Write a protein that binds this ligand. Structure first.
Ligand SMILES: Nc1ncnc2c1ncn2[C@@H]1O[C@H](COP(=O)(O)OP(=O)(O)OP(=O)(O)O)[C@@H](O)[C@H]1O
Ligand SMILES: Nc1ncnc2c1ncn2[C@@H]1O[C@H](COP(=O)(O)OP(=O)(O)OP(=O)(O)O)[C@@H](O)[C@H]1O
Ligand SMILES: Cc1cn([C@H]2C[C@H](O)[C@@H](COP(=O)(O)OP(=O)(O)OP(=O)(O)O)O2)c(=O)[nH]c1=O
Ligand SMILES: [Mg+2]
Ligand SMILES: [Mg+2]
Ligand SMILES: [Mn+2]
Ligand SMILES: [Mn+2]
Ligand SMILES: [Mn+2]
Ligand SMILES: [Mn+2]
Lengths: 289, 683, 289, 683
C-alpha cells in the first residue's frame, strides 16, 4: 500500500551537493572558535562514517533480502543516496572549509574513536548477521537501520542545525537539511518493513522482539551519551544534545510501531528554527494563432 | 549590522498589514548620514578636487582641458543645484558600490552622483559648456542614463572601453579562427561582451585541403573561444562573458546545442560561452508542416555556390541546397529540434533565439548585409560583413564587425518631464560622441564598422515602472498603446536627430544610399499609419507633448531624403542590469520579476522594492512570471515595430509549464514579429 | 585514476522515465506489420529480462566484492539506474504499446525461449560463482558483466535504433537511447575494474584469463547468432544485425583492454542515424660525485 | 591471420631452447609475396608512373621538372640496382604503413622503398643528377635517414612541412600570447611539434597596468595552448603535440608542475601539452647547499631592470633579485622542488629537464642569445630572440623562433661502409636543402630564424645496435670510447661541410662573427685534446677511415676562420621513433628498451627483435631498464661533448627505485654536462 508513494517521494527528492554553492559559509566558518570548528568537523566525520556503512552495507543487504522489484528499487535508490550523495556531500563541505591536513586528521580520528567504532561494530554486525530466508535476522537488522536513520544521526545533525538556526553556516546547513529530509523518509520506510515482519510473529515472539529492540536502543543510547559528551563538552552543549537524541530515539521507536521510551523535554528553540522540465510534443495547432 | 541595513530590512516587517516602504527612504538617509558622507573625500574647492583626480591618474586631462575651470565649475553647480536624492537605499548602494569613483585603496569615495554626472556630461559635450549643462540636466533629472561602460568609465584614465557589446564575424579558416580568438581576448580585456557568428565555419566532418573527415566543427572553435573568454576576464574582476551564434541549418546545430546540456562531457560543454541560435523562416515553415528538414555542411555549399550558407536567403536557397547532390546535408526533424531548443531553454535558458526573417524584413541596411546574428544580450541586430584575415605579411580584407553604443531613456522620468524629443536628441548626440571617441586598435573590423556605420543603440527602461505608477497593467491594451506611441515618438526624434547630425556634419553612414531610409521605404508604415494613442488615458499621459502625425512623418521622410541619416542604427533596448538600480527604474522594457527583491551582500541581507511600489499600485506591479507570456510578446512586438535593432526579450516561465508552452511562446513571438528572444527564466 | 571522473559522468546523465511522453508512439505502432510488432515485443522483453538480472544481481554483487568507498558509490549509482530507472522505463514502453494480456504472453514466451535463457543463465552463473576474497572469480564475473552491458544488449538495441533512425517509435526510441548510453558507460567502468585485477596477475595467469574471456565470448557469440536468426529472419534484418553484434563485441573486448576479435565492418546507416614511486628525501652527498 | 603474421609470431616459439629469429626473414618474404607485391601499383615504365603521380596531385611537378626523364630513370635504376631487402618484417611493415605513398582511398601502394628514396633524393639534389645518385646510394645503403617529415613528405603535393620541431618565444603580452596560440595552431596544422617558452610570461597575481593580482599566470596560457593543440591535431590524424617550457625560478613553477599531477583539477590539468623545466646551475647549487631558494615574479624583474628574468644570467643576478625590494619573490625549498620533479617524472615522465648552464657553457651562439628552452623532444638547444607582436596596424618586431631540420646517421651502416665523412657531408647538404626550401608563411619568427640561423639537426641512430652487433657492452668504457671518436668525426665533418657551404655560397649564418666558431674558442678542446680511440678494438673498428687529429682540427679551425660557417647549429640527436624501424636500427643513441618488442596492430600481434639480435649477441643487447643509468649518463655526456645542440636523453627506470634515485640520476647528469633529459620511463 505504500512502496509506490515512497518510490515517487524518493526520486522527486533527488539532489547533488554541487547544486549548493558553499563559498558563502567561508566567513561564518572563519569566525568560529577553534573548539567550535573541531566539534563541527568531528560531528560531520561521524555522520560520514554512518552514511558510508549505510550505503556500502546496510541498504544493499536489506535490498537483497526484501522481496519485490519495487521494494528493491526503493531500497537501491536509498542506498545510492547514502554513499553517492550523502557521504560525498560531507567531503564537499570539508574541502571548502578546511585545509587538507585538518581533513586528513579528522578521518584518522574516526578510525581511532572508540564510540564511533563501537556503534559501527554493532550496527554493521547486525547487517552481516542477516540469514537468507530468515525473517527474524532481517527484522533485527531493520531495527538497527531505523536506529541509525532516526536516532544515531541526530547527535551529529544537532550542530549544523544549531548554527543554521542562528543564521550561521547556512549553505552547509542547507545540505544537512536535505540529508535530514532523506533520512526521515528512509527511517519511516524501513520501519514499515520491520513492522511487517514483527506482525507475522506469535505474541511470545513479539515480546522477545520488543526486548531486542529496547535492549539494543539502550545499549546504543549509553554509547551515544559518551560520544555526545566527548564532542560537545568543549562547546558547552552536551546536555542540550542529549535531550535532542532522546527526542529522536522516540521517533525511531514510533517508526517501529512502538511506544515512546523517554519523557518529553524542551529542545533548544534555535535547533527548532534550524528545521529537467516536463516535455510535450508540438501539435500542428501550436504553429497557428 | 549597520543602521541603514536594519532600516532597509524593516520594510518586510508589516505594520497594519502593509509593507513599510517609506522606511526605505529613511535607510537612504542613514546610508548617507553614517557611511557615504563619512567615507567621501572632500576638498576645499572643486579646483583642488579636479587637480587631485587628474594628477593621481583618476581622470583624463584631455576632456577637462577643453573647458575653462569656470565652465567646469558651472557644470558642477548645475549638477548640484538639483539637490538630487536617491529615493531608495539600493539606488545609492549600487551607485556607490559599482559606479562611484574610489581611491586606489578602495576605502574612500572620490565621486558623488553629481560629480560622476558632471564628469560624464563634460566628456559628452567635448568642449561645449552649454551642451555639458544640458547633459547634466538630462542625467540629474534621470531622463537619460548612459550604459554601465559609458557611465562608469567616461572621463576616467584607468578605464575600459565605453562599448561593451561587440559582434564578430568568423570566416571559415584557421587564420580567421585564430584572429577571432585574439580579438575576443582583446575586447574582453577592454571589458566588452563579445558575440561571434560561427555559421560560416564548416561543420564537423568536413574537408581541409581535400582531406576528408578533418574538421572539428564549430564545437572545437567554441571550446577555444570559451578558453579565451575564461582567460580574458577583465584583469580578474568579472567572469569573461562571450556568446556564439549558429544558424539552425548549420549541421553542428545539435552539437552546438549539446554544449549546453548538463549531461555533456567536459570536452563538449562550454561554461562561460553563451549560445544563440538563428532561426530563419524556412525552419519554422518546415516545423509547421512537419516536413523533415536538412542541416547543411557549410563548406560544401560554399564550394558549390561561392558564398557562405548564412550569406544567402535560405527561404529561396533551401530547395536548391536539398536538390543539389554536391551539397552535403543531414536529415533532421525540425519539430524535434524545436522541442530540444525548448528543453534546453527550460534547463539553462539557452540558446538565444534569433528569428532571421523577422529581423531582416524590417532591416534598413539589407543592401550592406542581412543581420546574421545578435550580441551577447540578443538585442543588437545590424548588418555585418565577414573579414578575410590572411596569413602573415599579407594584407587582410577588413569587413564590418558590429559594435553599437548603449544608452537608455528612463520612460517614467522622460514622460513626466514631457521631454521625449529633447531627451532622445541629447541621448543621440551623446551616443554619437561616444561612438566617435571609440578607437579600438586590436579589432580592425570593429573599428572600421564603428567609423563607417556610426551605429548607436538608444534603449528605454522603467516601462513597467511607469505603467504601474500610472495605474496601467503591463498586459493591458492601454500599456501596448502607450508603448506604441512612446516608441514611435522615440523613433521619430531619433531619426530626426540622426538626419540633423548628417546635415550638420555633411556625412551619412557608409552605404546609406542603398538603405531603406534613402529610398523612403522605412517611412512607409509611418506615412500611412497614425500611431497616436487610441485610448483617452494614454492621450492624457502624452498631454503637453507633440505627438508626430503622418504629416510630420512625411516631413521627416523628406528631410532624410534631402540630408541623409548619420547613424545606420539608432535604437536598441538593452537589459540595463545595474544602471536601473541607480536610476530607480525597472530593468529595460521587461516586466518586473519580483515586487520586492531580496539580495545578499557580504553577510548582510537587503530588500529592494520596485520603484514607486505602494499599496495602491501593488496590483499593477504584477510579477513577470504571473503574467501571460503572449501579452508580453504582444507588448514587445509593439515596441519592436518602432525599434530598428532588437529588444532584449527574456521569457518568464513558471515551473509548471512544459516545453510545449515554451515552444508556443517562441512560435507566437515569431508570428508577432519578435526579432530576438533572450532568456527563459523559470521561477 | 578514474572513479571520480566516472562518478561525474554517471550522475550528470541522471534521468527519469516520466520525462519522455510515450503516447505519441501509437501513431506509428499501428502502422507496423504483425512480424515487426512481434519482433519488437520479443526484443523488448529480452532486454527487460536481462536488465533485471543486472539490477538484482550483476551490479549489486560486484559492488559487494569491490574494495574502495568511491567505487562502491559509483557501482551503487549504476545499480540504482538499473532498478529504479531502466526497469520502470521498459515497463512504461510495454504498457503503452500492448494490452496487459499481450505483455504477459510475450514474457511467458521469452521466459521459455532457448537462446534468451542460454545467455541469461550463463551470465547469472558467473555472478553466482564469485567467492569472497577471490579476485579471479570477481574478474570472471566482471567479464560477464561487460559482455552483457557492451555486447549482449545490442542484438536487442538494434531494432529500436532501426525504427528510431527511420522516424518510427521515436518516444520509446529516445528512452532506449538513454538506456543504451547508461549501459555503455557501465560497460566501460566495469571494464576498467576488470583490467585492474588482470594487471595484478602473472603472465601465465593473464594468458589463462585471456583464454577464459575469448572462450566465453565465443560461446555467447554463437548463441547470439542463433538468437538473431530466431528473431530477425521474419523481418529480413539478420545479416545487418550480425554485423552490429560483432562491432559491439569488439567494443566489449576493448573495454577489457583486449584486442578486437572480429574484422572491422560498416554498420547499417539507419541504425547509425538512430545511434607513484616511493618518495625518499634527498640525503645530501647526492649532489657530489 | 595473415601468413606473414604467423611467421613473425613463430619467432617466439622456441626451437631447441632458442628463439627462431630467422623466421622473421621468412615473414618479410611472405609480407612481400602475399601483400606488398599484390597491393603495389605497377606501370608499363617509369614515365607512366611519374605522369600518373604528377597529374593526380601526388607529386609536386616542380622538383621533377629540374631533371630530364633520362636522369630520373637513371636515379630510379640506381635505387633499384642495390636490390635492397628489408631484413625484418616490421621494417617493411612500418615503411609501407607509415611512409609508402598510397592512393587517395589508401587501397593500393604507389611507392616502393626504392621509389620513395629516389623521390627524396631527387628533391634533395635540386636538379643535380650525380648528387641525386649520391643521395640514392646514401639512403638505399641506409647510411643516412631523413626525418619522418622529410622522408614522408619530400616531393609530395599533399605534403605538410619537412621541419619536425618548432620552438616559439612568447613575450609577456596578450597580443604576444594570442600570436603564439595562432602560430602554434598553424604549425600543428603543418604537422610539426611546437615548443613554447613561457618563462617571460608574468606569474599569477601580477599587475596588468596598475591593477594588481590580475594575471592568470602561465597556467592560463598553458590551458589556451592545450586547447589550441587539441584543435589543431593534423586534421584528426595525429594528436596535436605541444610543449611548454618554464624556468625553475619562475614563480608559477609549482603550478606549472601541478598541470601534470594525476590529482590535478580539470581547471588546472593539461593533458596534450608536454612540460619542460629549465634549471640553471644556481638552482642546483641552492639545492646542494640546502639553502632556501626564491622563485621570482618576471614582471617585477622586467620593470626594475628592463630585461626579462630568463634574458639574463641567474647565476650572477639571483642575489641581486633577492636583495632588491622592488623585485617580488616567493620562498621555496629547492630540494623539495627537486623531489617534486622526481615524483612527477616517476608518475608521468614529466617535466623535461633542461640544465641551462650545461647548455650555455658550450653554446657557440651565446652572443645572439642564450638557450632558454628546448623543443618537444628536448634535443634542440639554439639561441632564440623573443618577438614583439604589437597591436593591429602596428609593425611587429620579429625575433628568432627556433626551427631545425632533422636527419639521422645510421651508425652501423655508416661505419660498415667506412663513410663517416661522405655520409656526414651529404646529410648536411640534404638538411641545408630542406632548410632552404622551407618557407612558413604564418610563423614570421620561425621563417626569419630559418633564413638567418640556417640551423640543421644531424642526428644518429643504431648506436646500441652497432655496439651489440660488434660485441661491445653499451655501458662499457669501450662503447664510450667509440662514441667519443665517432661523434668527434661527425662533428669534424659537419663543421667542414658547413664551412665548405659557407665558402661556396659566400655567406655565413647571421651574427656568425660573434660566435665561438669565428673566434676559434669552439675548437679549443679539439686543438689540444686527441679524440682517437684509446682501445685497440675501437681503433680496429675505425680502420680504413682517417680519424681527425689535433692537426686536422687546427686546419679546420683555420678554414672556418677564413670562410665561416653556413649553419649556426648542425648536430642534434632526435629520438627517431618510428623511422628507426625502416632503417633496421635501434632508436637514436639510447639503449634498447627491450630485446624483442610485442606490438599490437589491428587485431594481430607482432614481435620485432632488435636489429641483429641473436644467440651470440643476446647479452650485448642489454635492456635499458637493466642498465646503470649513471653509465648511460656517461655515454650521453661523451656524445654530447661533440654535439652542439642537445640529445633526447630518456631515463629508463625500474619500479623498485625511489624518487631519490631519480634525483641522483638527474644530478649526476647535471654534473656530467648533460644538457637535457627527455623522459623518465618506468618499467
Ligand atoms: N536620500 C539621499 N540621497 C542622496 N544624498 C543624500 C540623501 N540623504 C542625505 N544625503 C546627503 O547627506 C546630506 C545631508 O542631507 P540632509 O537630509 O541631512 O539635509 P539637507 O538639507 O539636504 O543637507 P545639506 O546641508 O547637506 O544640503 C545631503 O546634502 C546629501 O549630500
Ligand atoms: N625482404 C624483402 N624486401 C624487399 N622487397 C622484397 C623482399 N622480399 C621480397 N621482395 C620483393 O618481392 C619480390 C619477390 O622476389 P624474391 O625476393 O622472392 O626473389 P626472385 O623472384 O628470385 O627475385 P629477386 O630476388 O632478384 O628480386 C622481389 O623481387 C622484391 O621485389
Ligand atoms: C589581458 C590579460 C593579460 N593577462 C596577462 C598575460 C600577459 O602575459 C600579461 C601582459 O598583458 P598585456 O597585453 O601586456 O597587457 P597591457 O600591455 O595592457 O599591460 P602592461 O602595460 O602591464 O603590459 O598580462 C592575463 O593574465 N589575463 C588577461 O586577461
Ligand atoms: Mg581556407
Ligand atoms: Mg604589455
Ligand atoms: Mn544518509
Ligand atoms: Mn538513510
Ligand atoms: Mn539497465
Ligand atoms: Mn547497466
Amino acid at each position: 500500500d505504500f512502496t509506490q508513494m515512497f518510490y515517487n517521494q524518493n526520486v522527486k527528492q533527488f539532489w547533488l551537493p554541487e547544486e549548493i554553492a558553499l563559498n558563502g559559509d567561508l566567513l561564518t566558518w572563519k569566525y568560529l572558535g577553534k573548539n567550535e570548528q573541531d566539534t563541527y568537523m568531528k560531528v560531520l566525520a561521524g555522520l560520514t562514517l554512518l552514511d558510508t556503512e549505510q550505503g556500502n552495507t546496510g541498504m544493499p543487504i536489506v535490498a537483497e533480502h526484501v522481496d519485490g522489484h519495487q521494494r528493491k528499487a526503493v531500497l537501491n535508490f536509498m542506498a545510492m543516496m547514502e554513499n553517492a550523495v550523502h557521504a560525498k556531500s560531507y567531503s564537499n563541505i570539508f574541502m571548502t572549509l578546511a585545509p587538507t591536513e585538518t581533513i586528513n586528521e579528522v578521518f584518522e580520528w574516526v578510525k581511532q574513536n572508540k564510540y564511533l567504532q563501537k556503534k559501527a561494530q554493532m550496527i554493521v554486525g547486525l547487517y552481516k548477521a542477516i540469514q537468507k530466508d530468515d525473517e527474524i535476522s532481517l527484522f533485527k537488522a531493520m531495527v538497527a537501520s531505523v536506529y541509525l536513520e532516526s536516532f544515531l544521526f541526530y547527535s551529529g545533525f544537532y550542530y549544523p542545525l544549531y548554527f543554521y538556526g542562528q543564521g550561521k553556516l547556512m549553505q552547509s546547513g542547507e545540505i544537512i537539511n536535505l540529508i535530514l529530509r532523506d533520512e526521515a523518509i528512509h527511517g519511516v520506510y524501513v520501519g514499515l518493513l520491520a513492522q511487517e515482519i514483527y506482525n507475522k510473529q506469535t505474541e511470545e515472539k513479539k515480546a522477545e522482539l520488543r526486548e531486542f529492540a529496547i535492549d539494543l536502543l539502550n545499549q546504543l543510547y549509553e554509547n551515544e551519551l559518551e560520544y555526545t559528551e566527548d564532542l560537545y563538552d568543549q562547546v558547552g552543549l552536551s546536555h542540550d544534545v542529549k535531550k535532542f537524541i532522546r527526542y529522536n530515539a522516540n521517533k525511531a521507536l514510533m517508526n517501529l510501531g512502538f511506544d515512546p521510551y523517554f519523557e518529553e523535554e524542551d529542545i533548544n528553540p534555535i535547533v527548532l528554527n534550524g528545521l529537467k522540465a516536463t516535455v510535450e510534443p508540438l501539435k500542428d495547432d501550436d504553429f497557428y494563432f | 549590522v549597520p543602521k541603514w541595513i536594519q532600516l532597509n530590512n524593516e520594510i518586510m516587517i508589516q505594520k497594519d498589514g502593509k509593507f513599510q516602504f517609506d522606511k526605505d527612504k529613511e535607510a537612504v538617509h542613514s546610508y548617507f548620514v553614517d557611511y557615504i558622507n563619512q567615507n567621501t573625500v572632500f576638498f576645499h574647492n572643486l579646483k583642488e578636487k579636479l587637480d587631485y583626480l587628474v594628477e593621481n591618474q583618476y581622470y583624463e586631462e584631455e576632456f577637462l582641458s577643453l573647458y575653462s575651470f569656470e565652465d567646469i565649475k558651472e557644470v558642477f553647480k548645475t549638477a548640484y543645484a538639483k539637490k538630487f536624492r536617491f529615493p531608495s537605499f539600493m539606488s545609492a548602494f549600487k551607485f556607490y558600490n559599482d559606479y562611484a569613483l574610489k581611491t586606489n585603496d578602495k576605502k574612500k569615495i572620490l565621486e558623488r552622483y553629481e560629480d560622476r554626472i558632471s564628469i560624464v556630461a563634460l566628456f559628452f559635450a567635448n568642449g561645449d559648456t552649454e551642451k555639458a549643462k544640458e547633459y547634466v540636466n538630462l542625467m540629474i533629472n534621470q531622463e537619460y542614463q548612459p550604459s554601465t561602460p559609458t557611465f562608469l568609465n567616461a572621463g576616467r584614465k584607468r578605464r575600459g572601453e565605453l562599448v561593451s557589446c561587440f559582434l564578430l564575424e568568423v570566416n571559415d579558416s584557421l587564420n580567421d579562427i585564430s584572429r577571432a580568438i585574439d580579438i575576443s581576448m582583446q575586447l574582453s580585456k577592454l571589458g566588452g561582451g563579445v558575440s561571434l557568428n560561427l555559421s560560416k565555419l564548416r561543420a564537423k566532418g568536413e574537408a581541409i585541403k581535400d582531406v576528408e573527415n578533418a574538421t572539428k566543427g564549430v564545437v572545437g572553435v567554441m571550446k577555444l573561444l570559451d578558453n579565451a573568454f575564461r582567460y580574458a576576464d577583465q584583469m580578474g574582476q568579472r567572469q569573461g562573458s562571450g556568446a556564439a551564434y549558429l544558424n539552425i541549418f548549420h549541421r553542428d546545430i545539435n552539437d552546438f546545442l549539446d554544449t549546453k546540456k548538463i549531461s555533456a562531457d567536459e570536452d563538449v560543454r562550454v561554461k562561460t560561452l553563451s549560445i544563440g541560435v538563428v532561426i530563419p523562416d524556412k525552419f519554422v515553415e518546415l516545423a509547421r508542416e512537419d516536413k523533415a528538414a536538412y542541416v547543411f555542411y557549410p563548406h560544401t555549399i560554399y564550394k558549390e555556390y561561392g558564398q557562405h550558407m548564412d550569406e544567402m536567403d535560405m527561404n529561396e536557397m533551401y530547395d536548391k541546397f536539398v536538390d543539389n547532390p554536391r551539397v552535403k546535408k543531414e536529415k533532421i526533424n525540425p519539430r524535434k529540434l524545436l522541442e530540444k531548443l525548448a528543453m534546453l531553454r527550460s534547463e539553462s535558458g539557452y540558446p538565444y533565439i534569433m528569428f532571421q526573417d523577422n529581423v531582416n524584413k524590417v532591416h534598413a541596411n539589407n543592401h550592406i548585409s542581412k543581420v546574421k546574428f545578435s550580441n551577447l544580450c540578443s538585442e543588437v541586430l545590424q548588418a555585418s560583413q565577414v573579414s578575410s584575415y590572411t596569413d602573415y605579411d599579407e594584407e587582410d580584407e577588413i569587413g564590418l564587425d558590429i559594435s553599437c553604443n548603449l544608452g537608455s531613456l528612463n520612460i517614467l522620468n522622460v514622460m513626466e518631464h514631457k521631454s521625449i524629443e529633447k531627451t532622445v536628441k541629447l541621448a543621440t548626440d551623446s551616443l554619437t560622441h561616444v561612438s566617435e571617441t571609440t578607437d579600438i586598435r586590436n579589432a580592425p573590423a570593429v573599428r572600421r564598422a564603428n567609423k563607417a556605420m556610426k551605429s548607436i543603440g538608444l534603449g528605454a527602461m522603467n516601462l513597467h515602472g511607469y505603467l504601474a505608477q500610472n495605474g496601467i497593467a503591463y498586459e493591458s491594451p492601454e500599456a501596448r498603446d502607450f508603448a506604441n506611441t512612446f516608441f514611435m515618438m522615440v523613433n521619430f526624434y531619433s531619426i530626426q536627430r540622426s538626419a540633423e547630425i548628417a546635415k550638420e556634419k555633411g556625412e551619412t553612414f557608409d552605404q546609406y544610399e542603398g538603405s531603406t531610409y534613402a529610398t523612403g521605404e522605412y517611412f512607409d508604415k509611418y506615412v500611412s499609419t497614425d500611431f497616436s494613442p487610441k485610448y483617452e488615458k494614454i492621450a492624457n499621459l502624452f498631454e503637453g507633448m507633440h505627438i508626430p502625425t503622418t504629416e510630420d512623418w512625411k516631413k521627416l521622410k523628406a528631410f532624410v531624403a534631402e540630408h541623409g541619416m548619420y547613424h545606420s542604427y539608432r535604437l536598441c533596448i538593452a537589459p540595463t542590469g545595474s544602471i536601473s538600480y541607480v536610476q530607480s527604474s525597472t530593468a529595460s522594457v521587461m516586466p518586473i520579476m519580483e515586487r520586492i527583491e531580496e539580495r545578499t551582500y557580504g553577510n548582510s541581507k537587503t530588500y529592494y522594492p520596485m520603484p514607486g511600489l505602494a499599496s495602491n499600485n501593488w496590483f499593477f506591479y504584477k510579477e513577470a512570471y504571473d503574467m501571460d507570456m503572449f501579452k508580453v510578446v504582444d507588448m514587445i512586438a509593439t515596441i519592436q515595430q518602432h525599434i530598428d535593432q532588437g529588444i532584449s526579450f527574456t521569457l518568464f516561465l513558471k515551473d509548471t509549464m512544459t516545453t510545449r508552452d515554451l515552444n508556443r511562446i517562441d512560435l507566437y513571438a515569431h508570428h508577432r514579429g519578435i526579432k530576438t528572444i533572450y532568456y527563459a527564466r523559470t521561477k
